[PDB]
Design a protein around this ligand. Sequence first.
Ligand SMILES: *[C@@H]1O[C@H](CO)[C@@H](O)[C@H](O)[C@H]1NC(C)=O
Lengths: 49, 37
Amino acid sequence: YGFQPTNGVGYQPYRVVVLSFELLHAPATVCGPKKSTNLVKNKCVNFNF
Amino acid sequence: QCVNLTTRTQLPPAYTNSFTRGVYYPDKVFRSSVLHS
Ligand SMILES: *[C@@H]1O[C@H](CO)[C@@H](O)[C@H](O)[C@H]1NC(C)=O
């Protein structure tokens, strides 16, 4: 590419980043930041592990 | 610093029989008496 500053759009350079989330078969890894309250037992509950 | 070690041996390698070896768990997934293919 011979890029030059006086190029019409669609010929100017764009930077690209491709994030690819993969899930092999480990025990866990990085994730978003939730809260992580606590835990309870012997009650019908709505859980996220 | 490395050495010529290899002596030429006329004998070929032998062959044995792997009766039932080399089986692994292809996941970290718990199963309990489930016949899995
Ligand atoms: C043995 O080592 C010498 C150097 O010490 C090397 O010139 C020669 O190629 C080696 N022999 C073989 C068969 O590679």
